[PDB]
UniProtKB/Swiss-Prot annotation, chain D:
Subunit of the fusion protein that is processed upon entry into the host cell. Mediates fusion of the virion and cellular membranes by functioning as a class I viral fusion protein. Contains a viral fusion peptide that is unmasked after S2 cleavage. This cleavage can occur at the cell membrane by host TMPRSS2 or during endocytosis by host CSTL. In either case, this triggers an extensive and irreversible conformational change that leads to fusion of the viral envelope with the cellular cytoplasmic membrane, releasing viral genomic RNA into the host cell cytoplasm. The lineage of its organism: Viruses, Riboviria, Orthornavirae, Pisuviricota, Pisoniviricetes. It comes from the Viruses. This is Spike protein S2'. Glycans are attached at residue 92. The gene is S. Disulfide bonds join 50-61. The chain holds residues 983 to 1079 of 1273 of the full protein.
Amino acid sequence: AYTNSFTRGVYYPDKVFRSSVLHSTQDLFLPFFSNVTWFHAIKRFDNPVLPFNDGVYFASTEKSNIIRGWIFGTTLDSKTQSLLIVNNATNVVIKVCEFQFCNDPFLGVYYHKNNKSWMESEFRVYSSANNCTFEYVSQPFLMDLEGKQGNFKNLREFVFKNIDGYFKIYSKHTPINLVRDLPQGFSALEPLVDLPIGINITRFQTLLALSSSGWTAGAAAYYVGYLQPRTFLLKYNENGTITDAVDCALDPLSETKCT
Amino acid sequence: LKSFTVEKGIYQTSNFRVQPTESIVRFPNITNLCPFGEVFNATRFASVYAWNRKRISNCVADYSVLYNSASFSTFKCYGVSPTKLNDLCFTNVYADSFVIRGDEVRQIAPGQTGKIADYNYKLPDDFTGCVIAWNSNNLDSKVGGNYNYLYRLFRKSNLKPFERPLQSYGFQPTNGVGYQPYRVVVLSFELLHAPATVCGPKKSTNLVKNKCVNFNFNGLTGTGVLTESNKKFLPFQQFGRDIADTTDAVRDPQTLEILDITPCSFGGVSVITPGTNTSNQVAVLYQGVNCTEVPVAYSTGSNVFQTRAGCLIGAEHVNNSYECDIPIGAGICASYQTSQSIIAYTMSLGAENSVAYSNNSIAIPTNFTISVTTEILPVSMTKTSVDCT
Amino acid sequence: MYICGDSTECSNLLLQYGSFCTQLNRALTGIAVEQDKNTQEVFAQVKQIYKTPPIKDFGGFNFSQILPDPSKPSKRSFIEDLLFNKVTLADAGFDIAARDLICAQKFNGLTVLPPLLTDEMIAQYTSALLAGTITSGWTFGAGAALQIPFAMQMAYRFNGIGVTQNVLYENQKLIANQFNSAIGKIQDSLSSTASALGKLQDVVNQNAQALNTLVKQLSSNFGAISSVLNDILSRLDPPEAEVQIDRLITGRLQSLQTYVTQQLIRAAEIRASANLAATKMSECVLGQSKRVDFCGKGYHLMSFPQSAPHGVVFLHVTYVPAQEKNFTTAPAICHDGKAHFPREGVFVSNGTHWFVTQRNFYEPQIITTDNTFVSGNCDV
Amino acid sequence: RLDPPEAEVQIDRLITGRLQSLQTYVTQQLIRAAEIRASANLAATKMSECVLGQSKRVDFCGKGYHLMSFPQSAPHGVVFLHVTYVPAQEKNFTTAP
Amino acid sequence: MYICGDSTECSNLLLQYGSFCTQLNRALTGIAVEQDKNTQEVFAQVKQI
Ligand SMILES: *[C@@H]1O[C@H](CO)[C@@H](O[C@@H]2O[C@H](CO)[C@@H](O[C@@H]3O[C@H](CO[C@H]4O[C@H](CO)[C@@H](O)[C@H](O)[C@@H]4O)[C@@H](O)[C@H](O[C@H]4O[C@H](CO)[C@@H](O)[C@H](O)[C@@H]4O)[C@@H]3O)[C@H](O)[C@H]2NC(C)=O)[C@H](O)[C@H]1NC(C)=O
Ligand SMILES: *[C@@H]1O[C@H](CO)[C@@H](O[C@@H]2O[C@H](CO)[C@@H](O[C@@H]3O[C@H](CO)[C@@H](O)[C@H](O[C@H]4O[C@H](CO)[C@@H](O)[C@H](O)[C@@H]4O)[C@@H]3O)[C@H](O)[C@H]2NC(C)=O)[C@H](O)[C@H]1NC(C)=O
Ligand SMILES: *[C@@H]1O[C@H](CO)[C@@H](O[C@@H]2O[C@H](CO)[C@@H](O[C@@H]3O[C@H](CO[C@H]4O[C@H](CO)[C@@H](O)[C@H](O)[C@@H]4O)[C@@H](O)[C@H](O)[C@@H]3O)[C@H](O)[C@H]2NC(C)=O)[C@H](O)[C@H]1NC(C)=O
Ligand SMILES: *[C@@H]1O[C@H](CO[C@@H]2O[C@@H](C)[C@@H](O)[C@@H](O)[C@@H]2O)[C@@H](O[C@@H]2O[C@H](CO)[C@@H](O[C@@H]3O[C@H](CO)[C@@H](O)[C@H](O)[C@@H]3O)[C@H](O)[C@H]2NC(C)=O)[C@H](O)[C@H]1NC(C)=O
Ligand SMILES: *[C@@H]1O[C@H](CO)[C@@H](O[C@@H]2O[C@H](CO)[C@@H](O[C@@H]3O[C@H](CO)[C@@H](O)[C@H](O)[C@@H]3O)[C@H](O)[C@H]2NC(C)=O)[C@H](O)[C@H]1NC(C)=O
Ligand SMILES: *[C@@H]1O[C@H](CO)[C@@H](O[C@@H]2O[C@H](CO)[C@@H](O[C@@H]3O[C@H](CO)[C@@H](O)[C@H](O)[C@@H]3O)[C@H](O)[C@H]2NC(C)=O)[C@H](O)[C@H]1NC(C)=O
Ligand SMILES: *[C@@H]1O[C@H](CO)[C@@H](O[C@@H]2O[C@H](CO)[C@@H](O[C@@H]3O[C@H](CO)[C@@H](O)[C@H](O)[C@@H]3O)[C@H](O)[C@H]2NC(C)=O)[C@H](O)[C@H]1NC(C)=O
Ligand SMILES: *[C@@H]1O[C@H](CO)[C@@H](O[C@@H]2O[C@H](CO)[C@@H](O)[C@H](O)[C@H]2NC(C)=O)[C@H](O)[C@H]1NC(C)=O
Ligand SMILES: *[C@@H]1O[C@H](CO)[C@@H](O[C@@H]2O[C@H](CO)[C@@H](O)[C@H](O)[C@H]2NC(C)=O)[C@H](O)[C@H]1NC(C)=O
Ligand SMILES: *[C@@H]1O[C@H](CO)[C@@H](O[C@@H]2O[C@H](CO)[C@@H](O)[C@H](O)[C@H]2NC(C)=O)[C@H](O)[C@H]1NC(C)=O
Ligand SMILES: *[C@@H]1O[C@H](CO)[C@@H](O[C@@H]2O[C@H](CO)[C@@H](O)[C@H](O)[C@H]2NC(C)=O)[C@H](O)[C@H]1NC(C)=O
Ligand SMILES: *[C@@H]1O[C@H](CO)[C@@H](O)[C@H](O)[C@H]1NC(C)=O
Ligand SMILES: *[C@@H]1O[C@H](CO)[C@@H](O)[C@H](O)[C@H]1NC(C)=O
Ligand SMILES: *[C@@H]1O[C@H](CO)[C@@H](O)[C@H](O)[C@H]1NC(C)=O
Ligand SMILES: *[C@@H]1O[C@H](CO)[C@@H](O)[C@H](O)[C@H]1NC(C)=O
Ligand SMILES: *[C@@H]1O[C@H](CO)[C@@H](O)[C@H](O)[C@H]1NC(C)=O
Ligand SMILES: *[C@@H]1O[C@H](CO)[C@@H](O)[C@H](O)[C@H]1NC(C)=O
C-alpha cells in the first residue's frame, strides 16, 4: 500500500548546536507527504531486495527485534564487499565482508504459537564468510526486547545514507500510542553511527528471523521511504533540539515560510 | 594625517587587539592502537616465499615505541620520514613478516639482482612501504640448524614480479654476520581504496581558561577566550554556532564540557589632541575596550577613566560641566583647560532656566535689537572629467 | 581584521590592494559623524534648558502624559516610555550594554560607536522644548522665553488660524476636554497597536540585516577550495595558498565595498529624513505653521516633540471644523446705492435675514458700518 | 620585460585593479553630487523665500523674526546675511483675557 | 537568470559567491515598492472622490 507520511524523516543534518535559530539546510531529506511502501513482516514471506537510491527511511512497529538487520551492496553475492548489519538481542555485528548470501537467509522459527516453546528448524541466516576486509562488533547491550504485547512503544525510525565514502546511520526510538499505521507526530532522528566504509551500495535487503498449512501470520510491518535532495527549514528550540521543520518546496505557503 | 601639524579634534589611529598569550591544542585520547606490538613480537614469521600478510586499519600507527626502541637494528623509509609520519594519514597498511638469511637482506632492496627476489617478494621501483629488519639470530637459530628456511628458489617455471641458491647449511648461534637469520617485516600501505582511517597519534595540551589563546579543537582552529559555559549540548553535538553562522561554543574532546568562545578584546585607538601650537599634550581613547586590558598592548597611566565609549588615558576626569569641545561618546567630551591639561567631563546641554510662568502674568518686550547672522551653503563642487582609457 | 583575521600572509597580500581599507574607514567615519550631526540638528534647538513650574495650572489643559516623570530612573514621559518599549532591537544590545557590545559581529572586526547624545540628554532636550512651548508660546524660539498664560497662548493660536479668540475664551472647557481626550486616545493607541513605529523598526531591522549579511559573507568560498583561511594555509603550500587567499580577499573586499555603498545610500536617506524632522521641529514646535498638511492634517495649532529610539515623534494638535450649515450667501450688499463688502467675514442668511460672520465659525452678527466697507455703487 | 603571451596576465591584474578604483571613485562622486544637489536646492529655496520676500517660517531665514536677507557669493557656495528682529528687554505685567 | 541563464553548472558556481543575488533582488524590489509609495503619496491625498 502507498501509505503517506506526515512529517517524519527529519534528522539532525550535522553536529552543531543552535539555540532558538531557524536554520535552513539543503540536504538529502524525505519529502513531506510522500508515498512510502508498507510491507507485511511475515508461504508468504515478504523480503525482497529493494533499491538504495541515495538514502532510505526505514520505519517499523516490530517488537523483540523481528527485523534483525540489513544488507547493503551492489552485487550481494560475495563477489564484491557487502555491508552487513545483522543484529539480535546482544548487539550489532556490523561486518563489511564478502559474505556468501543464501537465497533464503532467514532463521525461520515458529516460536510460542501452538505449544508455547521456542524451536529452530534451520539456521541459514549465515552461509559462509568466504572473505572479509573490515569488521566491527559493538558492546553487548540489551534493548527493551522483552515480550510486552500491550500497545506498541517502539517506532524504530532509521535513516541510512552513504556520501563521500561515509555510511551514516541516523535513528531514534519514539514510543507510540496507536498500533495502527504511523501516527502523526514530530521527532528528529539523532546521529547513531558513522562508518568510514567507502563501499558502494546500489541495492539493499532486510533480514528476518521467521508449515504453511494453517499458519498464523505474524503481526508486524515496515515502511520503506526514499530520500531526495531538498531544502528544509529547521526550528531549533532553546535546548538545541529540532522542534519543527518546513519543507521549502511542498507548497507555496511553505516556500514563502522558507523565503 | 601625513602632516607635521594636526588640527584640534579626535583622530583615528592604529587598531588595538589583544595578542594571544599561548596556543592550546585538544584532541581525544589515542585509544585505537594498531597491533604493531603483535606484528613485531610474533614468535615465528612465515616462510620467505609464503610471507604472511596482515591487514592493519582503523587504528593509530604510532611509532614512538617502535623507533625509540633499540631492539631493531636496521630501518629505512625510502618514501616517507619518521618526522612527518606522525602528521600523515593512510588508508590501509599491510604487515608482511618473514625470516630470511642475512645475505638476502641485500636482495630485499628494490630492483636488485637475484631471481630469489622476484620468486619470494619483489619490490617495485615505486615501493614507498617502509621496511624493518632486525637480527633474530638466537630466536631463529636452532642447535642443529633451522633448515625450514630452504633457499632452493630456482624453480624451472618463471614467477613474474608480484604474480599474485642452496648456500645455507644450518642456522646456528655460531653463524657469522650476514649468515645469521634476520626477521624482516614490511609496512606496505595503499592509497585510494577507502576514506583514510589510519593516522599518527595527535598530541594534546593542558586546558586553559580566561586567557586569549589559540585553540585547536578536533581541527577547528580559532583564537579567543575560553570560558565555562552553562549551555547544554546534545550528546552527539560538538560545536555551537550563532545566528551569523560563527562558532561561539565548543565541547572539549577530552573532558565532555561546553566552553564559550569570546573574541579577544579589540577596538580602535583614537587620539584626542588640541592644536599643535596650543600644546603637544594628548590623550588616547581605546574605543569599546576595558581599561584593565589596555596596558596589555602610556602603560603606566596614572590617569584612567572608564567611560561608556572606552578607557580614556591622559585626561583628567572633572565633574563640572561645560559645552562640548572634542566629542568622545556617551555624553563625554574632552577639552584643554587650566597647569593646562586635558579634562574629560559630561557635557552640559545649556544653562538651566525656570520660566516664571503663571496664570495672569505676561512678559512683553520693551526694546528690540536688530541681529544679523551669516549662513553658508554649498551650491556646487568642482567639475571633473576622467579619461577612462 | 575582517578580510584577513589573524593572518600575516593574507595581510601582506591585502597590502597589494592597499588604500581600499582607508577609503572604507573614511566613509564609515563620515557616516557616523553625520549621524551625530543629525541628532544634534534635530534636537539641540534650545539655548537654555527650560523647566515647567511646580504648579500645572495650564488653564485646564493636561500635559502630564507628555511631561517628564521624576519617579522613573530615566526622566522620560509616559509616551516616551511607551515608544521606547515598543521599539525592540533584533540582534542584541547596541543600549543597556555593560560590557563588550555583545554581538557576533565582534568576531569579525565590527564595532558600533555609541551615540554622542545619550537617551537621557535627548529626553532633557525634549523636556526643555516642551516646557518652553507650554510656558512661553513661540517666543522662546525667537529669543528670550516670555511667559504667558496658556489660555492666552491658545487664543493667539486661534487668531493665527483665523478664528476669533472669543471662541476659545467661551469654549475653553470644551477645548481642554477635547485635547485631554485626544491625548488619552493617542496613549491608548500607542499602547495597543504595534505597527505605529514601522519606520523606526524598519531602520533598525535594515541595519541589523545588513550587518548579518556582511558577517555571513565570510562563509563563502568565492571559488576558493575552502572558506577557512587557516584550512587553506595548512592544506596548501605558498603558491596555491596565495592564489586561493587572493580569491578570498577579492570576495571579502567586494562584500565590504557593497556593504559600505549600501550604508552610504541609507545614510543619505536618513539625513534627508533628519533634515525634514529638524524643519518640522523648528516650524511646528517652535512656532505655528500656515503650510497645509505640514504639521498634521487640519489647521495647525501646536506640536509637541517626544524622543523615540533613533528618531523623533511629533504630536500635532490641529483644529478641524465639525458641523456645517449652508446659509444663502451674497458677495456684497446694497444699502443706498453703495456696495458694502465684509471687512473680515462673509455675508450669510438663514432664510429671512442677513448677517456677517467669520469664515471658520458660525457667529452671526448684525450687518453694521463697522463690519463692512463701502466701494463703488450697486450696478457693478 | 615580458613577452605578449605572459604579459597579458599582469596587464589584466592592473586593469582589474584600476577599473575597480575608477568605479569606486565614480560611485563616491555620484553620492557626493546628490548631497550637493540637495544643498543647492535648499540654497535656491532660501534665496527665493528670504531674499525675494519675507518668510514667516520659523528659523528658516535666520534666528528670530525674519526681516530681510542679503546674498553674497562665495567659492562654490552662497552666504546669506539674515537680518532678524529680536526682542531684548522684557518688562512684564499682570494680564487678563 | 541574467548571470547564468538556464545553466545548472553556472548556477552552482554562482552559489559560491554568497548572497549577492539576494541583495540585488532586495534592492530592486525596494525601489519598485517605493515607486508605488511615491505615486500614492503624491496623488492619493483625499479619501473621498
Ligand atoms: C434668521 O435670523 C433672524 C434674527 O433676526 C430671525 O429673525 C427673528 O428676530 C426676532 C428678534 O429680532 C426673534 O424673535 C423675537 O422674540 C422676541 C421675544 O421672543 C424671545 O424669544 C426669541 C426666540 O428666538 C428670541 O429671539 C427673542 O430675542 C426673545 O428673547 C419678540 O419680542 C420679537 O418681536 C419682534 O417684533 C418686534 C416688533 O416689530 C421687534 O421689536 C422685535 O425686535 C422682534 O423683531 C421677536 O419675535 C425671532 O426668533 C427671529 N426668528 C427666528 C426663526 O429665530 C429670522 O427669523 C431667522 N430666519 C430663519 C429662516 O431662521
Ligand atoms: C460642539 O462639539 C462639542 C464636542 O462634540 C459638543 O460638546 C459636548 O456634546 C455632548 C453631546 O451633545 C454634550 O452632552 C454631554 O456629553 C458628555 C460627554 O461629552 C456627557 O458626559 C454628558 O452627560 C450625559 O450624557 C452621558 C453620555 O455618556 C451620560 O453618561 C451622563 O450620565 C449624562 O446623561 C452629556 O451627554 C456635552 O455637554 C457637550 N459638552 C461641551 C460643549 O462642553 C457640543 O455639544 C457641540 N455643540 C455646541 C457647542 O453647540
Ligand atoms: C491628566 O492625565 C493623566 C493621564 O490620563 C492623569 O493621570 C492618571 O491617568 C490614569 C489613566 O487615565 C488615571 O487612571 C488610573 O488611576 C488609578 C488610581 O487613580 C490614580 O489617579 C487619581 C487621579 O486621577 C489619584 O487621585 C489616585 O490617588 C491614583 O493615583 C491608577 O492606579 C492607575 O494607574 C491609573 O492612573 C489616573 O487616575 C490618573 N491620575 C494619576 C495620579 O495617575 C491625570 O489624572 C490627569 N489630570 C492631571 C491634573 O494631571
Ligand atoms: C518677569 O518678572 C519677574 C519678576 O517680576 C515679577 O514676576 C513677573 C512675571 C511679573 O508678574 C512682575 O509683575 C513681578 O513683579 C522675573 O521672574 C522672576 O525672577 C526670579 C528669577 O530671576 C524667579 O525666582 C526668583 O529668583 C530670585 C533670584 O534668585 C530669588 O531671589 C527669588 O527669591 C525668586 O526665587 C521669580 O519666581 C520670577 N517670578 C516672580 C513673580 O518673581 C522675570 O525675570 C521677568 N521676565 C520674564 C520673561 O519672566
Ligand atoms: C529544555 O527547555 C526547557 C524549557 O523550554 C527548559 O526548562 C526546564 O525544563 C525542566 C524539565 O524537567 C524543568 O525541570 C524542573 O524540575 C523541578 C524538579 O527538579 C520541578 O519542580 C520544576 O517544576 C521543573 O519541572 C526546569 O525547571 C525548566 N526550567 C529550567 C531553567 O531549567 C529545560 O531546562 C531545557 N533543558 C536543557 C538541557 O536545556
Ligand atoms: C583522556 O584520559 C584522561 C584521564 O586523565 C581524561 O582526563 C580526565 O582526568 C581525570 C583526572 O582527574 C581522570 O580521572 C577523573 O578524576 C576525577 C577526579 O577524581 C573523577 O571525578 C573522574 O570520575 C575521573 O575518574 C578522568 O578519567 C579523565 N576524564 C576522561 C573522560 O577520561 C580525558 O578526559 C580523556 N579524554 C578522552 C577519553 O577523550
Ligand atoms: C534700545 O536698545 C538699544 C541697544 O540695543 C539702545 O542703544 C543705545 O545706543 C546709544 C548710542 O550708542 C547709547 O548711548 C551711549 O550711552 C553710553 C552710556 O555710557 C555713552 O557712554 C555713549 O557715549 C552713548 O551715549 C545707548 O547707551 C544705547 N542704549 C542702551 C539701553 O543700550 C537704545 O538706547 C535703547 N533705547 C531705549 C528707549 O531703550
Ligand atoms: C547476536 O549478536 C552478537 C554480536 O553482536 C553475537 O555474538 C557473536 O560472538 C562471536 C564471537 O563470540 C562473533 O564471532 C560473532 O560475530 C558475534 N555475532 C553473531 C551473529 O554470532 C551473538 O552470537 C548473536 N546472538 C546471540 C544469541 O547472542
Ligand atoms: C613487544 O615489543 C615491545 C618492544 O618495542 C616491548 O615493549 C617495550 O618497547 C619499549 C620501546 O620503547 C622498550 O623500551 C621496552 O623495553 C619494551 N618492553 C619489554 C622488552 O619488556 C614489549 O615488551 C614486547 N612484548 C612481548 C615480548 O611480549
Ligand atoms: C489661575 O488664575 C488666577 C491666578 O492664580 C487664579 O485666581 C485666583 O488665584 C488664587 C490663588 O491661586 C486662588 O486662591 C483664587 O481662588 C483664585 N480666584 C478665583 C478662582 O476666583 C485661578 O484660580 C487660577 N485659574 C484660573 C483663573 O482659571
Ligand atoms: C572590565 O573588567 C571588570 C572586571 O572586574 C568589570 O567589572 C566587573 O567585574 C565583576 C567581577 O569582579 C563582574 O561580576 C562584573 O560583571 C563586571 N562588570 C561588568 C561586566 O560590567 C568591568 O565592568 C569591565 N569593564 C568593561 C568596559 O568591560
Ligand atoms: C500515494 O498514491 C495513492 C494512490 O495513487 C494515493 O492514495 C496517495 O494520495 C498517494 N500519497 C501521497 C502523499 O500523495
Ligand atoms: C509446536 O512447537 C513449536 C514451538 O516450539 C511450534 O513452532 C510448532 O508450530 C508447534 N507444532 C506444530 C505442528 O505447529
Ligand atoms: C577475498 O575473497 C575471496 C574468497 O574466496 C578470494 O578471492 C580471496 O580469499 C580474497 N581475494 C582478495 C582479497 O583479493
Ligand atoms: C561501486 O563500488 C566500488 C567503490 O566502492 C567502485 O570501485 C566500483 O567501481 C563501483 N562500481 C560501479 C560504480 O559500477
Ligand atoms: C595656534 O595659533 C593661533 C594664532 O595665535 C592661536 O589663536 C591658537 O591659540 C593656536 N591654535 C591651536 C589649535 O592650537
Ligand atoms: C565628581 O563627584 C565626585 C565626588 O567625590 C568627585 O570626587 C569627582 O571630582 C567626580 N567623580 C569622579 C570619579 O571623578
